[PDB]
Amino acid sequence: QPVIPVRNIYYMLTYAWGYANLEAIPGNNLLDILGYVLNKGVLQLSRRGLELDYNPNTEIIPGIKGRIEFAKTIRGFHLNHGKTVSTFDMLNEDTLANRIIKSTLAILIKHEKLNSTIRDEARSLYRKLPGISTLHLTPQHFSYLNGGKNTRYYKFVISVCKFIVNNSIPGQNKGHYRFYDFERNEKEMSLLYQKFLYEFCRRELTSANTTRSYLKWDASSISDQSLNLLPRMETDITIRSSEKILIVDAKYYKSIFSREKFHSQNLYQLMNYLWSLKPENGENIGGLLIYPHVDTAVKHRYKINGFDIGLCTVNLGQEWPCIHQELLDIFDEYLK
Amino acid sequence: QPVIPVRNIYYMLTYAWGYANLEAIPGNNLLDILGYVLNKGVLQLSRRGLELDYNPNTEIIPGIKGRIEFAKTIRGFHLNHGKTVSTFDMLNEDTLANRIIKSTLAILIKHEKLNSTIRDEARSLYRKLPGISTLHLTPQHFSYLNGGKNTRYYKFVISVCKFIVNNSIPGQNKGHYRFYDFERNEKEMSLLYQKFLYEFCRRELTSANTTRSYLKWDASSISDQSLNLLPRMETDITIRSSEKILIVDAKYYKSIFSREKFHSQNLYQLMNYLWSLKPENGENIGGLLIYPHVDTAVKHRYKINGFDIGLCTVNLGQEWPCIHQELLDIFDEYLK
Amino acid sequence: ALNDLFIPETTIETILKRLTIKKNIILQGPPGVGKTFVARRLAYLLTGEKAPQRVNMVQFHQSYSYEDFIQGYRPNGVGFRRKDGIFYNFCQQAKEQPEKKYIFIIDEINRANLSKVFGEVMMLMEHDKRGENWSVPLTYSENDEERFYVPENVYIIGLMNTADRSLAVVDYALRRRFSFIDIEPGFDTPQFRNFLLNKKAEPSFVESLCQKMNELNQEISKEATILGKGFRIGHSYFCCGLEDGTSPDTQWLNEIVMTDIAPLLEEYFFDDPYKQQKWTNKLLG
Ligand SMILES: Nc1nc2c(ncn2[C@@H]2O[C@H](COP(=O)(O)OP(=O)(O)O)[C@@H](O)[C@H]2O)c(=O)[nH]1
Numbered sequence: 001q002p003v004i005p006v007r008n009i010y011y012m013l014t015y016a017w018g019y020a021n022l023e024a025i026p027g028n029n030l031l032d033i034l035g036y037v038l039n040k041g042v043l044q045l046s047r048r049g050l051e052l053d054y055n056p057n058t059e060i061i062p063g064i065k066g067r068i069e070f071a072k073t074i075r076g077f078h079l080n081h082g083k084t085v086s087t088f089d090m091l092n093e094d095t096l097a098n099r100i101i102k103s104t105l106a107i108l109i110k111h112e113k114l115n116s117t118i119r120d121e122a123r124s125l126y127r128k129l130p131g132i133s134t135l136h137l138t139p140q141h142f143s144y145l146n147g148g149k150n151t152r153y154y155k156f157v158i159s160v161c162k163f164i165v166n167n168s169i170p171g172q173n174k175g176h177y178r179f180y181d182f183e184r185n186e187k188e189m190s191l192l193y194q195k196f197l198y199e200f201c202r203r204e205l206t207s208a209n210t211t212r213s214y215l216k217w218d219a220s221s222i223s224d225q226s227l228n229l230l231p232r233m234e235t236d237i238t239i240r241s242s243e244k245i246l247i248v249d250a251k252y253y254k255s256i257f258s259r260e261k262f263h264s265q266n267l268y269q270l271m272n273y274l275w276s277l278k279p280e281n282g283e284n285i286g287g288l289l290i291y292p293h294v295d296t297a298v299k300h301r302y303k304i305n306g307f308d309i310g311l312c313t314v315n316l317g318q319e320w321p322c323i324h325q326e327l328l329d330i331f332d333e334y335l336k
Numbered sequence: 337q338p339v340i341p342v343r344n345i346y347y348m349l350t351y352a353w354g355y356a357n358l359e360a361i362p363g364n365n366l367l368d369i370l371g372y373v374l375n376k377g378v379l380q381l382s383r384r385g386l387e388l389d390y391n392p393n394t395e396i397i398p399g400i401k402g403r404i405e406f407a408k409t410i411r412g413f414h415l416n417h418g419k420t421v422s423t424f425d426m427l428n429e430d431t432l433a434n435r436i437i438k439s440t441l442a443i444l445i446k447h448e449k450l451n452s453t454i455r456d457e458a459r460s461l462y463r464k465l466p467g468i469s470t471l472h473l474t475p476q477h478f479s480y481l482n483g484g485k486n487t488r489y490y491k492f493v494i495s496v497c498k499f500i501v502n503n504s505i506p507g508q509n510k511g512h513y514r515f516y517d518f519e520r521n522e523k524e525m526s527l528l529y530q531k532f533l534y535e536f537c538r539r540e541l542t543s544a545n546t547t548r549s550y551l552k553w554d555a556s557s558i559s560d561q562s563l564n565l566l567p568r569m570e571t572d573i574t575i576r577s578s579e580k581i582l583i584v585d586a587k588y589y590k591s592i593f594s595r596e597k598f599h600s601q602n603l604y605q606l607m608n609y610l611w612s613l614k615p616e617n618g619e620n621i622g623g624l625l626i627y628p629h630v631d632t633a634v635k636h637r638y639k640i641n642g643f644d645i646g647l648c649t650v651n652l653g654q655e656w657p658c659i660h661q662e663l664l665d666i667f668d669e670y671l672k
Numbered sequence: 673a674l675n676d677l678f679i680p681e682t683t684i685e686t687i688l689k690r691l692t693i694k695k696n697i698i699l700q701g702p703p704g705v706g707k708t709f710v711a712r713r714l715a716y717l718l719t720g721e722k723a724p725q726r727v728n729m730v731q732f733h734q735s736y737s738y739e740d741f742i743q744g745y746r747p748n749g750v751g752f753r754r755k756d757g758i759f760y761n762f763c764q765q766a767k768e769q770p771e772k773k774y775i776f777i778i779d780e781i782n783r784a785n786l787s788k789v790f791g792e793v794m795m796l797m798e799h800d801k802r803g804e805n806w807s808v809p810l811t812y813s814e815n816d817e818e819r820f821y822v823p824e825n826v827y828i829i830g831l832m833n834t835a836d837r838s839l840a841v842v843d844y845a846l847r848r849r850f851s852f853i854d855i856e857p858g859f860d861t862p863q864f865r866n867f868l869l870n871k872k873a874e875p876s877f878v879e880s881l882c883q884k885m886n887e888l889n890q891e892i893s894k895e896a897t898i899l900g901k902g903f904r905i906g907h908s909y910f911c912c913g914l915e916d917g918t919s920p921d922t923q924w925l926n927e928i929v930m931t932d933i934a935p936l937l938e939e940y941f942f943d944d945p946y947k948q949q950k951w952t953n954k955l956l957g
Binding site: 217218219220221222223224228229230231232261262263264265267268269271272275300301302303304305309311 | 555556559565597598599603636637641647
């Protein structure tokens, strides 16, 4: 039951969210890593300054501040006890984005399995934000912020905060928390991997164009033009260049970590993607199978039904730059 | 979260094992049904007579029975105290097959959720088999009997006994047992379904020939002739007739029970089965998708890539004969 | 015979109180805690004298029989002659000195069927039915008048191996009479440590050695139903092998780990080699 070294996982998450030295931290487990980013990440913001969004406030005060609302004043007779219903703009850091940070930190402190120094620093910051109000967090809170007015930097830590909240489980005690065993589940790990590549390829493969391509079946049915019954088919990624087009389907399987029979069931999807897809340019059509392995990388080529297909692997756990080196080498060979 | 009525499930299990009125029993849950078969099933055997297999016994007795082993007699000096080491054939019902029944019944009685009358009858039989020895059962015990010397009838109840043992979980108490929620898991339910059809079609579709067909990829790789890395591909069933060949891939999905998007991910396997398979006869090539639904049955046809493909369903929970009627109708249309 | 026993002092006293009362003790536990050694030394404790003659030790196996144990008719050159066994003869010595304590050691008693072996005598060996009053003529007794009576002086010690997965159920006949006692591995104990400290062992190697073994013992004992607590590794290998005065160090340790414990892990862990490789690395690495 072998798994990836935890430090390497953080890099793929970064590309997934689209935005460093982790040698310093000694806690190998993820939450130690993840908290150190957040705990330090907030500190980066505070140096420049946290977001202050003007919240208009309509309240009853003993005097004129901003704009008086004449109606509520007369109806409540607040003139008599020397008060007005007035609208004015207090400037707070109490926005939804910043509130999430402090509320997220509470769970971070409450986590049972955590480095003490990390918990020490976090508890300091928790105190350092008195004005902001604690909250009981839900995904809908993160949902409201998908508008993304905030800076590019804020969206990073919030993406971190989203990962923590969804991957937080109460542990030994009712109050305390315990981290999810993220690596063990394949689906989210695979869904990470599928998303990891799509954003990664845009960065490095500037030469090529990277798109996820929706496809329509070549079928026609006398029954229905809709073909709703047919499976929805959307490529994981397509990486088109003028000389050659190329589709990749990548998934995380547990069997493959064992070096025997091979689990390539996803391949069955691939041919049908090649088939229904028709290029006007007619430069070429290629496919790739790429999986994560631990020890070593092996690359093969295939010529099956008029299609050029590759099976390849990467030895995650080696080193991130050499891993980064390997991927650029990989796509270059096949793309050519 | 709707599931099949439990009584109908028993019929597909019967075809799976390749060998009735259940209106009598009032306990809808499976174990009530399953025990009634076993409890009555044993009674059917006893009327004709249970299997008696001669176990040779080499033991020390005060006289000649069968064949004396001269060596152990002299070496142990048993002549002096008027004894011999002799081989003879006691006739018992204590065989592995029959021992399994009584040991299986113990778990049956111990099950916490069970009809009282069923438990009453079983406890009677448990007493009625004194000579046979209780056992702590394992799959290896069933494994040793795959030779199948026993009659066609014995193999039926043992197949039942296998289902119980594998689908038995201890419940509230350490001793007592509680039945597995078999229906909820799709994989075994699907694996039932895949096996159900293969044996079923041999019975009814005597007109056609029914075979599971192994396939080899059309690919060639310069790297390896083996293509071990490639997925192993074995059809679920193939139902070949002189006029037309036809492949079926059937699986149980939870999404489909909801009448929306449709889960047909297995279809991706299907085309590649059609492609690598090449008929010398060149009569025709056809494919079918068939799934289980609860309410209703809907049949569609497709002409995709030069292949003739059908999507169809059956309303399990209707009635077994009308269900049996529906299947024969289904295969007939498409086969034609 | 009480200079260096790695076991805590509490249990060894508990047994002595228990032994003088019940007179039939079972020491369970993994192989490699010196069940023979502790019992052999314990025998001298109850007598208080480091005298071998009163003590005798025998190893049971499936084919061990009443004939070897007590009485049999072996042939001489011409004709058969009754031959006294161990236990029968053993008691004749004990009858001479009822004041003194005579002790019988039975290793791996669980393996054999006790009933065929003891036979008639299994009733008597219990502490209550002892003395001349409960004397019985033996199975082979030609004359009824000759009888066998278990004297009170006799104390019988039984050693049972917990380690086997093959074990399913303890014999009933054993359980009714004997008082089961479980021996912990006691890898983390002062006397074993100070013995090692007196030998050329640094505390870091001791703390390293004690630390790793405890985590291993807890792991196997933790999954109790799949594997018994008695599977957990003992300490006896580390005791012996230092007679030459060799310094115990990681150089010396790694042989014992790989040579002796490694197959034990292989038998215990027949399911996942990666799981084996995980724990073997931690012991040295
Ligand atoms: N000095 C000392 N020796 C021990 C201790 N435990 C075991 N030994 C020695 O380990 C060696 C093997 O003992 P034993 O268990 O009888 O071997 P076995 O027949 O394989 O089980 C003997 O020298 C024992 O005396 C102990 O606690 N102290």
